[PDB]
Amino acid sequence: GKSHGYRSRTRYMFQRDFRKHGAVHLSTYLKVYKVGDIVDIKANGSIQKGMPHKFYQGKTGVVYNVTKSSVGVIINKMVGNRYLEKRLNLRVEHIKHSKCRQEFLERVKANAAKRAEAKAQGVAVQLKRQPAQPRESRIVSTEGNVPQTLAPVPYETFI
Amino acid sequence: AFQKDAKSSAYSSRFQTPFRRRREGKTDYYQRKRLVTQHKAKYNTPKYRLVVRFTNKDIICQIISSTITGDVVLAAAYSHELPRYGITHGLTNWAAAYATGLLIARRTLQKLGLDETYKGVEEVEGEYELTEAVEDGPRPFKVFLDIGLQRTTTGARVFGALKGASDGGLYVPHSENRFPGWDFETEEIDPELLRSYIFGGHVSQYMEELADDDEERFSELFKGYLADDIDADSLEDIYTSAHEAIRADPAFKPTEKKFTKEQYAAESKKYRQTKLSKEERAARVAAKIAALAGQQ
Amino acid sequence: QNPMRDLKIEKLVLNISVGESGDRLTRASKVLEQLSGQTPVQSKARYTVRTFGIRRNEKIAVHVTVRGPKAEEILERGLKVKEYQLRDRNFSATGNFGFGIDEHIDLGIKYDPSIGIFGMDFYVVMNRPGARVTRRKRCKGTVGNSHKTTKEDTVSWFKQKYDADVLDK
Amino acid sequence: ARRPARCYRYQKNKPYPKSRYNRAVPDSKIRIYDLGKKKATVDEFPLCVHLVSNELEQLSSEALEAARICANKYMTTVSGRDAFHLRVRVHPFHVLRINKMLSCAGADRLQQGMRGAWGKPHGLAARVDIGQIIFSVRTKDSNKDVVVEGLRRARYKFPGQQKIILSKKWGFTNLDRPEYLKKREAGEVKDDGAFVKFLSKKGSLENNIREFPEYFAAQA
RNA sequence: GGUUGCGGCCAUAUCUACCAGAAAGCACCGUUUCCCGUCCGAUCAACUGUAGUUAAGCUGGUAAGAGCCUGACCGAGUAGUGUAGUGGGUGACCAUACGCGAAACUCAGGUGCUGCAAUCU
RNA sequence: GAGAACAGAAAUCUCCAGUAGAACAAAAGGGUAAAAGCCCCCUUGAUUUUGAUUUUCAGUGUGAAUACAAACCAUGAAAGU
RNA sequence: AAGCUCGUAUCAGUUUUAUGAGGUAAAGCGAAUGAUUAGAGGUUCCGGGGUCGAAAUGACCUUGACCUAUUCUCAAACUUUAAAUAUGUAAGAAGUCCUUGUUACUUAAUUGAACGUGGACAUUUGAAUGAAGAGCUUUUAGUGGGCCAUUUUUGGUAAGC
């Protein structure tokens, strides 16, 4: 027949690591998780308890429930032609803070930092993130750097 | 000098290594993780733990919290300061841990400022009891034990500080079936024998045990008591006078410590060897290749 | 340059392998009661052989160990039967040696023909004052290379005592 | 059977080696890969012309077996057996499968159609990449003319458009020919059986003195 | 700057072979009455730092060291790959255009940092 | 790897190296080293109540599992499980 | 199809910034497991076959294996490294900051956790481009034999398989 088990096709997916085996360190437990915090999912094969399904790996959700030794997350699964709000309760070793979000946090205060300076001096907000603008006109120097002629190399097998 | 095994480069490549505090055999991480993990619904409330490690002729006792940056010590209590209170000898006996236990438990309360309540027991009859919560008041301080590597055997010196911590004004979850004298045949407990062990009964009964049987064995040990003219009948009086002395002013008056840090630092670099530079590395190998490989 | 470091007896172990199971097991076990002065214990098999008449978990042989200052006095009594003669080999690379002898009756004790002849064996382990590090529970280390017992060291340490020859080559 | 190699000429499948899942596989046709004066030292054979394939295809063990006999039989009779060190640099690892339809009147009894068409191994064929070096002759400079034609007589028995190229750099070991002569007398060469062990600057100094004496003294 | 206790990162600290450690501490150590467990106090259990230590543990220094890590217009715009063509070639396969871009190799360097408390000529 | 009378390669004992190359009931894959592997003390948490979530899914059952609530327990000195 | 509530609210088969996850292509096996070619250095008493020797853990060879440094070629059910394509999330007014309450939870502790009370941040309010408007409900016809082409790949030699 055909095998469609809970953890099927997971052979290079739940491997612990190379040269990083053994019990998980204690920093993963000492982090504080609060309701409404963006996180990431990375299943840890060390302890199978509270481990997500193979579908959820690298997925990002929001923390809504915080029990004694587990954390509840919500996953917007795409099944069929729509998004369904799938709620998942995971232990603290299969989860880590998504530092994509935190970068936005100091960006909030960074804009707020010179917000006070903007009103102190005057106007000139320009806090919208500009994309990679094209380069402006620049001049090159030749003193001490002379152009070096180059030609395609003739063919030779050297084997 | 065993080159027959000749551990290959491949073996040295894929060898997974334990943690630094485990490679040197100082931490059992299987027990460690279950002791530090706070209730996730408690958010940012630290879980304080009390360490008791019995090194040679000294006891380690301190209150320490945990953090990602590193474990954070709240208060400390060492055996070396017991001579200040009056316990000049017997620094590593079973009763010595209990004396520190009253010292460590009381010390944390002053810096907390809540010593007015939760006095513990001041009579010490050896009976089992916990510092029950006071009605219409703050909850009793709770703290766990840290043993780690010495086997849990009844009568161990580690539990001496446990009684001191328990009876010193702190709440520590503990049972009676490991104290020094709890009967193994049945559930019976004899606090009278514990009351001797708490107040140095074990050493005191061995005082007269040699005072009549053999003197040379008595002479070669117990040098301080003979020199300082202290007998067994006054031995328990020392511990009884010790307990209320600790509670008089357990302010942890630091030592004058002599000198300062820099001269302590200066004494180190003046004798400790430094690193070696790449020019020094190149210089000697050139000399070695010239002297040895140069064929004179 | 000879500090307190020296070579001393760690333990003396005794072994009497038995050809089969039966009453002679108890007969052989009780011998160590009056020799070591202590209670011997059981050594059990690891797997079946099917041609030696033994199989899995049948308590083929007994053994006992003796330590401390109460261990060396056994040594010379055992050395009487060999006329104080040793071999170049019989010394392990880890600085230990042993020897197996039969008609143990020459060690003493009445013949007692209800007892018979038992080939009790010897093996003595030597170490230094500080080899405890490999047996400790906290900060378990390993014996240093310059401090480990060696076959040349045990032979050298054995030769200045007992005035015993080495025979062979 | 031995159907024509036109079926298995092209790389049409993933590698299918002889593993614990691959049992009852027929043995390789090629038996001895290296032949000639195999015990020859390195410095005695400065020249070695290779033979490189041009396109992607699979070369069977029978093709390798037939070519080696044709090449070896030639240089042994004109140059002599103690003139060259011939090596085959491809090993048959891919396994060839057949469906095994019988040739008699079938249909009613033959195979009940192509139901369950997975076949049983028939042969063992190598897999050849683009520009991958095949064969190596390790001859002397005075014997280049004979050897090159010898490989020419062997290229005909392979399926494909494999070519012969004038190689360089002492084509038994790596590193350029003029550079090897520079290190021949400099002292970075240890005369070892068959291949030559080079010199390393990263090991310990003490052991290097033993096997590499003529680098640190005056020498020549 | 050394040492101890508890750690964080966790082989830039692991391993092999040598040398050194006045200072405090680390560990060996000495004792078998009471607790306790072993055949064996060797581990574990209890007692004073007593009778010597730094031999060992630990720390520190070296190896044209084995490994680890870092960097490199070193390999190499190489292999591979997304988009495109009535592009080449019969076929396999291969170039070109707009983009992305490895690994092995080679060379050079480093071969622990740090938090809390106490203490240390 | 080095040694002990029978005992020899497989009888029982001791030392060294040994990241595991063993063992986890039965397939295969992950996981496991003061451990989930050996053995030892106590115990039935393989208990009661009915919710919520994941896999197959239609987002229905079924099997399996996950973390919790309100009780009574087992164990360990305890955190905890 | 019937529509319904409101109207640039906010959404996107797209790109960028930041940040995860993924073990295929490649590459490697003088890295683990399998293979796998050919030699060099010791080794066999706890291997056998030839000279001598009562005689071996005796002197000299070889055969078959081990250890060391090497060498040629590979793995869909091999693997340290690791692409390209594709893929998850965020780019904020349901947001941030300061004071403060309630709670039967938690905490040694009006100390923590959820939400509001008073005040500040407004049109670059805090990536690009686009938006025949955004969202929502009911009902039901037909549909449940497919085929072909570039790209990747499975079975078979191959097929308009």
PDB file of N, CA and C (backbone and C1' of nucleotides) in Angstrom, chain G residues 63-93:
ATOM      1  P     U G  63      53.507 -13.642  -2.017  1.00  0.00           P
ATOM      2  O5'   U G  63      52.317 -14.546  -1.462  1.00  0.00           O
ATOM      3  C5'   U G  63      51.876 -15.690  -2.179  1.00  0.00           C
ATOM      4  C4'   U G  63      50.898 -16.503  -1.370  1.00  0.00           C
ATOM      5  C3'   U G  63      49.717 -15.738  -0.792  1.00  0.00           C
ATOM      6  O3'   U G  63      48.680 -15.532  -1.735  1.00  0.00           O
ATOM      7  C1'   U G  63      50.663 -17.110   0.884  1.00  0.00           C
ATOM      8  P     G G  64      47.926 -14.116  -1.808  1.00  0.00           P
ATOM      9  O5'   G G  64      46.954 -14.136  -0.547  1.00  0.00           O
ATOM     10  C5'   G G  64      45.903 -15.084  -0.452  1.00  0.00           C
ATOM     11  C4'   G G  64      45.212 -15.011   0.885  1.00  0.00           C
ATOM     12  C3'   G G  64      44.859 -13.616   1.375  1.00  0.00           C
ATOM     13  O3'   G G  64      43.666 -13.113   0.797  1.00  0.00           O
ATOM     14  C1'   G G  64      45.890 -14.821   3.122  1.00  0.00           C
ATOM     15  P     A G  65      43.261 -11.572   1.004  1.00  0.00           P
ATOM     16  O5'   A G  65      42.621 -11.538   2.462  1.00  0.00           O
ATOM     17  C5'   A G  65      42.656 -10.356   3.245  1.00  0.00           C
ATOM     18  C4'   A G  65      42.830 -10.670   4.709  1.00  0.00           C
ATOM     19  C3'   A G  65      42.941  -9.469   5.634  1.00  0.00           C
ATOM     20  O3'   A G  65      41.672  -8.935   5.969  1.00  0.00           O
ATOM     21  C1'   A G  65      44.625 -11.050   6.168  1.00  0.00           C
ATOM     22  P     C G  66      41.514  -7.373   6.301  1.00  0.00           P
ATOM     23  O5'   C G  66      42.116  -7.232   7.768  1.00  0.00           O
ATOM     24  C5'   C G  66      42.256  -5.956   8.368  1.00  0.00           C
ATOM     25  C4'   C G  66      43.232  -5.981   9.516  1.00  0.00           C
ATOM     26  C3'   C G  66      43.927  -4.662   9.806  1.00  0.00           C
ATOM     27  O3'   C G  66      43.130  -3.776  10.570  1.00  0.00           O
ATOM     28  C1'   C G  66      45.533  -6.387   9.739  1.00  0.00           C
ATOM     29  P     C G  67      42.738  -2.337   9.976  1.00  0.00           P
ATOM     30  O5'   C G  67      43.953  -1.406  10.412  1.00  0.00           O
ATOM     31  C5'   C G  67      44.302  -1.270  11.780  1.00  0.00           C
ATOM     32  C4'   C G  67      45.710  -0.760  11.946  1.00  0.00           C
ATOM     33  C3'   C G  67      46.080   0.467  11.131  1.00  0.00           C
ATOM     34  O3'   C G  67      45.603   1.677  11.690  1.00  0.00           O
ATOM     35  C1'   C G  67      47.798  -1.137  10.951  1.00  0.00           C
ATOM     36  P     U G  68      45.193   2.897  10.728  1.00  0.00           P
ATOM     37  O5'   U G  68      46.589   3.456  10.201  1.00  0.00           O
ATOM     38  C5'   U G  68      47.555   3.965  11.107  1.00  0.00           C
ATOM     39  C4'   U G  68      48.851   4.305  10.413  1.00  0.00           C
ATOM     40  C3'   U G  68      48.739   5.182   9.178  1.00  0.00           C
ATOM     41  O3'   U G  68      48.567   6.555   9.482  1.00  0.00           O
ATOM     42  C1'   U G  68      50.195   3.380   8.730  1.00  0.00           C
ATOM     43  P     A G  69      47.435   7.409   8.725  1.00  0.00           P
ATOM     44  O5'   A G  69      48.180   7.988   7.442  1.00  0.00           O
ATOM     45  C5'   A G  69      49.251   8.911   7.577  1.00  0.00           C
ATOM     46  C4'   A G  69      50.150   8.899   6.366  1.00  0.00           C
ATOM     47  C3'   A G  69      49.476   9.164   5.028  1.00  0.00           C
ATOM     48  O3'   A G  69      49.265  10.543   4.780  1.00  0.00           O
ATOM     49  C1'   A G  69      50.888   7.285   4.834  1.00  0.00           C
ATOM     50  P     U G  70      47.952  11.035   3.994  1.00  0.00           P
ATOM     51  O5'   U G  70      48.263  10.704   2.466  1.00  0.00           O
ATOM     52  C5'   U G  70      47.739   9.538   1.849  1.00  0.00           C
ATOM     53  C4'   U G  70      48.559   9.121   0.654  1.00  0.00           C
ATOM     54  C3'   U G  70      47.816   9.064  -0.672  1.00  0.00           C
ATOM     55  O3'   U G  70      47.697  10.326  -1.303  1.00  0.00           O
ATOM     56  C1'   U G  70      49.039   7.073  -0.384  1.00  0.00           C
ATOM     57  P     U G  71      46.383  10.675  -2.158  1.00  0.00           P
ATOM     58  O5'   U G  71      46.377   9.593  -3.327  1.00  0.00           O
ATOM     59  C5'   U G  71      47.340   9.631  -4.369  1.00  0.00           C
ATOM     60  C4'   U G  71      47.108   8.527  -5.369  1.00  0.00           C
ATOM     61  C3'   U G  71      45.707   8.451  -5.953  1.00  0.00           C
ATOM     62  O3'   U G  71      45.490   9.377  -7.002  1.00  0.00           O
ATOM     63  C1'   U G  71      46.388   6.296  -5.272  1.00  0.00           C
ATOM     64  P     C G  72      44.009   9.927  -7.289  1.00  0.00           P
ATOM     65  O5'   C G  72      43.334   8.771  -8.151  1.00  0.00           O
ATOM     66  C5'   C G  72      43.804   8.469  -9.456  1.00  0.00           C
ATOM     67  C4'   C G  72      42.858   7.549 -10.185  1.00  0.00           C
ATOM     68  C3'   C G  72      41.378   7.775  -9.930  1.00  0.00           C
ATOM     69  O3'   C G  72      40.850   8.840 -10.702  1.00  0.00           O
ATOM     70  C1'   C G  72      41.866   5.462  -9.800  1.00  0.00           C
ATOM     71  P     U G  73      39.624   9.716 -10.145  1.00  0.00           P
ATOM     72  O5'   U G  73      38.366   8.756 -10.306  1.00  0.00           O
ATOM     73  C5'   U G  73      37.995   8.245 -11.579  1.00  0.00           C
ATOM     74  C4'   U G  73      36.831   7.295 -11.471  1.00  0.00           C
ATOM     75  C3'   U G  73      35.628   7.811 -10.700  1.00  0.00           C
ATOM     76  O3'   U G  73      34.798   8.638 -11.497  1.00  0.00           O
ATOM     77  C1'   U G  73      36.142   5.599 -10.007  1.00  0.00           C
ATOM     78  P     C G  74      33.689   9.579 -10.817  1.00  0.00           P
ATOM     79  O5'   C G  74      32.508   8.573 -10.466  1.00  0.00           O
ATOM     80  C5'   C G  74      31.461   8.956  -9.590  1.00  0.00           C
ATOM     81  C4'   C G  74      30.619   7.771  -9.197  1.00  0.00           C
ATOM     82  C3'   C G  74      29.573   8.032  -8.126  1.00  0.00           C
ATOM     83  O3'   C G  74      28.397   8.621  -8.650  1.00  0.00           O
ATOM     84  C1'   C G  74      30.764   6.059  -7.601  1.00  0.00           C
ATOM     85  P     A G  75      27.577   9.695  -7.784  1.00  0.00           P
ATOM     86  O5'   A G  75      26.607   8.800  -6.895  1.00  0.00           O
ATOM     87  C5'   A G  75      25.810   7.785  -7.488  1.00  0.00           C
ATOM     88  C4'   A G  75      25.197   6.885  -6.446  1.00  0.00           C
ATOM     89  C3'   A G  75      24.457   7.582  -5.318  1.00  0.00           C
ATOM     90  O3'   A G  75      23.145   7.982  -5.678  1.00  0.00           O
ATOM     91  C1'   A G  75      25.891   5.940  -4.415  1.00  0.00           C
ATOM     92  P     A G  76      22.811   9.537  -5.918  1.00  0.00           P
ATOM     93  O5'   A G  76      21.357   9.724  -5.295  1.00  0.00           O
ATOM     94  C5'   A G  76      20.201   9.303  -6.004  1.00  0.00           C
ATOM     95  C4'   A G  76      19.091   8.896  -5.068  1.00  0.00           C
ATOM     96  C3'   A G  76      19.399   7.727  -4.145  1.00  0.00           C
ATOM     97  O3'   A G  76      20.091   8.142  -2.981  1.00  0.00           O
ATOM     98  C1'   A G  76      17.281   7.409  -5.164  1.00  0.00           C
ATOM     99  P     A G  77      20.926   7.091  -2.103  1.00  0.00           P
ATOM    100  O5'   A G  77      19.820   6.330  -1.251  1.00  0.00           O
ATOM    101  C5'   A G  77      19.080   7.003  -0.245  1.00  0.00           C
ATOM    102  C4'   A G  77      18.008   6.109   0.315  1.00  0.00           C
ATOM    103  C3'   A G  77      18.496   4.788   0.889  1.00  0.00           C
ATOM    104  O3'   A G  77      18.970   4.907   2.220  1.00  0.00           O
ATOM    105  C1'   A G  77      16.701   4.380  -0.585  1.00  0.00           C
ATOM    106  P     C G  78      20.481   4.492   2.584  1.00  0.00           P
ATOM    107  O5'   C G  78      21.273   5.876   2.628  1.00  0.00           O
ATOM    108  C5'   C G  78      22.244   6.191   1.640  1.00  0.00           C
ATOM    109  C4'   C G  78      23.531   6.687   2.255  1.00  0.00           C
ATOM    110  C3'   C G  78      23.550   8.142   2.697  1.00  0.00           C
ATOM    111  O3'   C G  78      22.960   8.335   3.973  1.00  0.00           O
ATOM    112  C1'   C G  78      25.521   7.655   1.477  1.00  0.00           C
ATOM    113  P     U G  79      22.371   9.771   4.391  1.00  0.00           P
ATOM    114  O5'   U G  79      23.660  10.694   4.555  1.00  0.00           O
ATOM    115  C5'   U G  79      24.601  10.463   5.592  1.00  0.00           C
ATOM    116  C4'   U G  79      25.815  11.345   5.440  1.00  0.00           C
ATOM    117  C3'   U G  79      25.542  12.839   5.394  1.00  0.00           C
ATOM    118  O3'   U G  79      25.358  13.402   6.681  1.00  0.00           O
ATOM    119  C1'   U G  79      27.009  12.259   3.637  1.00  0.00           C
ATOM    120  P     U G  80      25.101  14.979   6.851  1.00  0.00           P
ATOM    121  O5'   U G  80      26.562  15.574   7.063  1.00  0.00           O
ATOM    122  C5'   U G  80      26.796  16.972   7.009  1.00  0.00           C
ATOM    123  C4'   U G  80      28.177  17.319   7.504  1.00  0.00           C
ATOM    124  C3'   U G  80      28.676  18.710   7.155  1.00  0.00           C
ATOM    125  O3'   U G  80      28.178  19.710   8.027  1.00  0.00           O
ATOM    126  C1'   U G  80      30.370  17.118   6.703  1.00  0.00           C
ATOM    127  P     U G  81      27.104  20.784   7.501  1.00  0.00           P
ATOM    128  O5'   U G  81      27.760  21.368   6.172  1.00  0.00           O
ATOM    129  C5'   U G  81      28.967  22.114   6.219  1.00  0.00           C
ATOM    130  C4'   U G  81      29.353  22.623   4.855  1.00  0.00           C
ATOM    131  C3'   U G  81      28.259  23.344   4.084  1.00  0.00           C
ATOM    132  O3'   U G  81      28.111  24.696   4.485  1.00  0.00           O
ATOM    133  C1'   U G  81      29.354  21.801   2.659  1.00  0.00           C
ATOM    134  P     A G  82      26.649  25.339   4.662  1.00  0.00           P
ATOM    135  O5'   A G  82      26.039  25.329   3.191  1.00  0.00           O
ATOM    136  C5'   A G  82      26.648  26.062   2.138  1.00  0.00           C
ATOM    137  C4'   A G  82      26.168  25.588   0.790  1.00  0.00           C
ATOM    138  C3'   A G  82      24.661  25.578   0.592  1.00  0.00           C
ATOM    139  O3'   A G  82      24.136  26.855   0.277  1.00  0.00           O
ATOM    140  C1'   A G  82      25.555  23.523  -0.142  1.00  0.00           C
ATOM    141  P     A G  83      22.618  27.212   0.657  1.00  0.00           P
ATOM    142  O5'   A G  83      21.765  26.440  -0.443  1.00  0.00           O
ATOM    143  C5'   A G  83      21.211  27.131  -1.552  1.00  0.00           C
ATOM    144  C4'   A G  83      22.234  27.371  -2.634  1.00  0.00           C
ATOM    145  C3'   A G  83      21.713  28.065  -3.883  1.00  0.00           C
ATOM    146  O3'   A G  83      21.641  29.473  -3.745  1.00  0.00           O
ATOM    147  C1'   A G  83      22.933  26.157  -4.517  1.00  0.00           C
ATOM    148  P     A G  84      20.213  30.211  -3.726  1.00  0.00           P
ATOM    149  O5'   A G  84      19.693  30.083  -5.226  1.00  0.00           O
ATOM    150  C5'   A G  84      20.361  30.744  -6.289  1.00  0.00           C
ATOM    151  C4'   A G  84      19.813  30.334  -7.632  1.00  0.00           C
ATOM    152  C3'   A G  84      18.303  30.411  -7.794  1.00  0.00           C
ATOM    153  O3'   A G  84      17.823  31.721  -8.039  1.00  0.00           O
ATOM    154  C1'   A G  84      19.064  28.344  -8.619  1.00  0.00           C
ATOM    155  P     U G  85      16.486  32.233  -7.310  1.00  0.00           P
ATOM    156  O5'   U G  85      15.342  31.279  -7.878  1.00  0.00           O
ATOM    157  C5'   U G  85      14.970  31.320  -9.248  1.00  0.00           C
ATOM    158  C4'   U G  85      13.958  30.252  -9.585  1.00  0.00           C
ATOM    159  C3'   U G  85      12.658  30.286  -8.796  1.00  0.00           C
ATOM    160  O3'   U G  85      11.737  31.253  -9.265  1.00  0.00           O
ATOM    161  C1'   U G  85      13.476  28.078  -8.851  1.00  0.00           C
ATOM    162  P     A G  86      10.970  32.209  -8.225  1.00  0.00           P
ATOM    163  O5'   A G  86      10.154  31.205  -7.292  1.00  0.00           O
ATOM    164  C5'   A G  86       9.025  30.498  -7.786  1.00  0.00           C
ATOM    165  C4'   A G  86       8.712  29.288  -6.939  1.00  0.00           C
ATOM    166  C3'   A G  86       8.122  29.559  -5.562  1.00  0.00           C
ATOM    167  O3'   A G  86       6.728  29.817  -5.588  1.00  0.00           O
ATOM    168  C1'   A G  86       9.882  28.011  -5.357  1.00  0.00           C
ATOM    169  P     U G  87       6.076  30.853  -4.544  1.00  0.00           P
ATOM    170  O5'   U G  87       6.475  30.276  -3.113  1.00  0.00           O
ATOM    171  C5'   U G  87       5.856  29.105  -2.600  1.00  0.00           C
ATOM    172  C4'   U G  87       6.293  28.813  -1.185  1.00  0.00           C
ATOM    173  C3'   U G  87       6.039  29.911  -0.165  1.00  0.00           C
ATOM    174  O3'   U G  87       4.700  29.940   0.293  1.00  0.00           O
ATOM    175  C1'   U G  87       8.233  29.074   0.105  1.00  0.00           C
ATOM    176  P     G G  88       4.097  31.280   0.940  1.00  0.00           P
ATOM    177  O5'   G G  88       4.638  31.261   2.438  1.00  0.00           O
ATOM    178  C5'   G G  88       4.229  30.249   3.345  1.00  0.00           C
ATOM    179  C4'   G G  88       4.680  30.552   4.752  1.00  0.00           C
ATOM    180  C3'   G G  88       4.456  31.974   5.235  1.00  0.00           C
ATOM    181  O3'   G G  88       3.126  32.218   5.657  1.00  0.00           O
ATOM    182  C1'   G G  88       6.645  31.295   5.788  1.00  0.00           C
ATOM    183  P     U G  89       2.474  33.672   5.455  1.00  0.00           P
ATOM    184  O5'   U G  89       3.271  34.598   6.479  1.00  0.00           O
ATOM    185  C5'   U G  89       3.202  34.355   7.875  1.00  0.00           C
ATOM    186  C4'   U G  89       4.166  35.219   8.648  1.00  0.00           C
ATOM    187  C3'   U G  89       4.046  36.718   8.440  1.00  0.00           C
ATOM    188  O3'   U G  89       2.973  37.293   9.164  1.00  0.00           O
ATOM    189  C1'   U G  89       6.326  36.091   8.382  1.00  0.00           C
ATOM    190  P     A G  90       2.194  38.566   8.570  1.00  0.00           P
ATOM    191  O5'   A G  90       3.135  39.797   8.938  1.00  0.00           O
ATOM    192  C5'   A G  90       3.484  40.069  10.287  1.00  0.00           C
ATOM    193  C4'   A G  90       4.616  41.061  10.375  1.00  0.00           C
ATOM    194  C3'   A G  90       4.471  42.309   9.521  1.00  0.00           C
ATOM    195  O3'   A G  90       3.663  43.293  10.141  1.00  0.00           O
ATOM    196  C1'   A G  90       6.655  41.415   9.277  1.00  0.00           C
ATOM    197  P     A G  91       2.753  44.278   9.257  1.00  0.00           P
ATOM    198  O5'   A G  91       3.794  45.316   8.645  1.00  0.00           O
ATOM    199  C5'   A G  91       4.599  46.126   9.489  1.00  0.00           C
ATOM    200  C4'   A G  91       5.584  46.939   8.690  1.00  0.00           C
ATOM    201  C3'   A G  91       5.005  47.728   7.528  1.00  0.00           C
ATOM    202  O3'   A G  91       4.397  48.942   7.938  1.00  0.00           O
ATOM    203  C1'   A G  91       6.958  46.597   6.822  1.00  0.00           C
ATOM    204  P     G G  92       2.939  49.345   7.397  1.00  0.00           P
ATOM    205  O5'   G G  92       2.053  49.476   8.715  1.00  0.00           O
ATOM    206  C5'   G G  92       1.262  48.392   9.182  1.00  0.00           C
ATOM    207  C4'   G G  92       1.060  48.460  10.675  1.00  0.00           C
ATOM    208  C3'   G G  92       0.485  49.766  11.208  1.00  0.00           C
ATOM    209  O3'   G G  92      -0.930  49.819  11.129  1.00  0.00           O
ATOM    210  C1'   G G  92       2.392  49.177  12.469  1.00  0.00           C
ATOM    211  P     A G  93      -1.703  51.210  11.352  1.00  0.00           P
ATOM    212  O5'   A G  93      -1.825  51.345  12.935  1.00  0.00           O
ATOM    213  C5'   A G  93      -2.726  50.530  13.680  1.00  0.00           C
ATOM    214  C4'   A G  93      -3.779  51.356  14.380  1.00  0.00           C
ATOM    215  C3'   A G  93      -4.770  52.051  13.453  1.00  0.00           C
ATOM    216  O3'   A G  93      -6.096  52.122  14.014  1.00  0.00           O
ATOM    217  C1'   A G  93      -3.538  53.679  14.667  1.00  0.00           C
TER     218        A G  93
END
